[PDB]
Amino acid sequence: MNIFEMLRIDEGLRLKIYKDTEGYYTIGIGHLLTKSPSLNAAKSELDKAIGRNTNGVITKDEAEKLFNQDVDAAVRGILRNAKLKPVYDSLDAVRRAALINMVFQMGETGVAGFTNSLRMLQQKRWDEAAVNLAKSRWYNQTPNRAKRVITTFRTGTWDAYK
């Protein structure tokens, strides 16, 4: 298991524009296109992202490309963030993947705001962090996914994904 496979599981793969768990226009492997209610707008962002007139649909390869770029940007964002990087460098490889997943889903800004969980993770207080992480909107809105990420932080193994 790796970051790519883990997110491909959490996110799924869809070749036509769809709305995510929050009602926003997305395509591929959880690639958010826009928060705008407009489908034209979503189509417009898509075409710009792909470099062609896609008309709302893309190929598997195009989807994989976006995903690569998105995973890359997520790591980069973590490494460029002063509240995140330290946590991330302090973690083992499995738990780093959990942190990337959250960033991919919620943006760096949003993850940087879990101050207390970030500190517990940094101190290696696994159970405590897992309890604190669940006290969140993220956990109440997408509980299944959140449980898998949380278990990963708690155990440092990929069991939630096996």
Count the site residues for ligand XE by CB under 6 A: 5
- Token pair 């991919």 is found at 104
Q: Is 11 a catalytic residue?
A: yes
Alpha helices in the chain (DSSP H): 3-11, 39-50, 60-80, 85-90, 93-112, 115-123, 126-134, 137-141, 143-155
Q: Looking at this protein, which amino acid is placed at residue 23?
A: G
117 lines the binding site for ligand XE (CB under 6 A) = yes
Binding mask 113-152 for Cl ion (x = CB under 5 A): -----------------------------x-xx-------
Interior angle at CA 141, CA 42 and CA 57, nearest 5 = 25
Q: Which of residues 47-76 bind Cl ion (CB under 5 A)?
A: 49
Question: Buried b vs exposed e over 31-57: b needs ≥16 C-beta within 10 Å?
Answer: bbbbeeeeeeebbebbbebbeeebeee
Catalytic residue chosen out of the listed positions 20, 47, 64, 70? 20
Residue 142 binds which of ligand XE, Cl ion, none (CB < 5-8 A, kind-dependent): Cl ion
20 is catalytic: yes
**Catalytic positions, please?**
11, 20
In the annotated binding site for substrate, the residues are 32, 104, 117, 132
Binding site: which residues? 32, 104, 117, 132
Catalog residues that contact ligand XE under the rule CB under 6 A.
Answer: 102, 111, 114, 117-118
